[PDB]
Amino acid sequence: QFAKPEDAVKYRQSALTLMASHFGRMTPVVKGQAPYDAAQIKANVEVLKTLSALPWAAFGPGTEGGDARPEIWSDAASFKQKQQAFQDNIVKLSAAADAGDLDKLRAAFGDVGASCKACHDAYRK
Amino acid sequence: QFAKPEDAVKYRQSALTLMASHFGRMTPVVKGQAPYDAAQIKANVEVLKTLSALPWAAFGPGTEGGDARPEIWSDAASFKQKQQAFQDNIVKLSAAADAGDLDKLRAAFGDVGASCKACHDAYRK
Numbered sequence: 001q002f003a004k005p006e007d008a009v010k011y012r013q014s015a016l017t018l019m020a021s022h023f024g025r026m027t028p029v030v031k032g033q034a035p036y037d038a039a040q041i042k043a044n045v046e047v048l049k050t051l052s053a054l055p056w057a058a059f060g061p062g063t064e065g066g067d068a069r070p071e072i073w074s075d076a077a078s079f080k081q082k083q084q085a086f087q088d089n090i091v092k093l094s095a096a097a098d099a100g101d102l103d104k105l106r107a108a109f110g111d112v113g114a115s116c117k118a119c120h121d122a123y124r125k
Numbered sequence: 126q127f128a129k130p131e132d133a134v135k136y137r138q139s140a141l142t143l144m145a146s147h148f149g150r151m152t153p154v155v156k157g158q159a160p161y162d163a164a165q166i167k168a169n170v171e172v173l174k175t176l177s178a179l180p181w182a183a184f185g186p187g188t189e190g191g192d193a194r195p196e197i198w199s200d201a202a203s204f205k206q207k208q209q210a211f212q213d214n215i216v217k218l219s220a221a222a223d224a225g226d227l228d229k230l231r232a233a234f235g236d237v238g239a240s241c242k243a244c245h246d247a248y249r250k
């Protein structure tokens with residue numbers, strides 16, 4: 001699916017846009033601004049779970065481009081910990097949503113958001 | 126998530142790009158050009174299933190834009206049948222992949238592809 005590096009960039013940017021839309025739309029619920037519908041949030045977090053695993057395979061060898069910093073590949077072990085932190089946080093978010101626990105969902109959501117920002121600050125231009 | 130029509134366009138384009146990548150990468154397997162790994166295809170078709178439901182909510186009222194033709198909204202019943210045909214075909218593809226049946230997977234894949242093209246020819250500029 002990624003014949004040229006531009007194809008990997010296009011795919012990962014699309015995946016990250018979708019992941020961001022499914023994460024960000026839950027902000028009002030975790031802030032108490034909109035009612036918590038546990039079944040709807042559980043379904044949305046399943047979509048996010050699915051999406052959250054997709055970008056990383058499109059940052060393979062020779063896929064420099066987009067707004068991705070070169071240190072993703074020169075500091076691969078460190079990038080892998082930023083990715084793992086995020087994926088571990090998605091597991092926590094799923095656990096909270098599957099249990100229908102709003103207080104745990106809020107904590108997990110803030111952990112996910114902090115991991116998005118940590119990777120942005122180190123590896124996104 | 127779609128405050129302005131441009132946000133709905135961005136989301137749906139991202140979803141359609143991902144859906145296309147997960148569909149298209151199975152072409153060599155259904156053509157007999159690459160070995161069929163039933164468990165890998167089952168996992169990929171689950172991703173595609175997930176993705177295939179996402180664009181349509183981003184073609185709501187007042188979301189004209191992108192390469193979407195206006196007849197999506199002026200002929201809504203007809204667009205809904207092109208969308209349903211495609212989603213019905215994704216159910217067939219999932220059934221084949223879950224059963225590990227390559228011959229059924231090939232048929233279902235060609236049905237999905239024909240439904241992509243049918244909607245493209247009528248509703249994509």
Ligand code: HEC
Nearest residue numbers: 013016017020023065066067068082083086116119123124
């Ligand atoms: C590193 C491990 C990351 C984590 C975790 C998250 N993002 Fe990120 N993001 C990262 C990179 C290296 C890039 C640039 C990709 C490129 O090749 O250009 C991005 C990009 C985005 C984007 C823009 C996508 C686009 O349409 O171009 C968005 C909206 C984005 N990232 C959001 C986002 C959110 C909401 C995250 C947590 C849920 C998140 N990212 C995690 C690196 C990493």
Ligand code: HEC
Nearest residue numbers: 138141142145148190191192193207208211241244248249
């Ligand atoms: C109507 C019911 C559609 C079906 C079924 C499929 N697609 Fe489509 N697609 C459709 C429209 C109206 C548009 C334009 C969206 C816009 O606002 O611009 C598209 C677009 C695409 C794209 C381009 C996405 C982008 O990055 O801009 C691709 C790659 C695409 N469609 C592929 C595709 C495939 C592979 C499909 C079947 C698996 C498929 N589409 C179905 C309408 C419809």
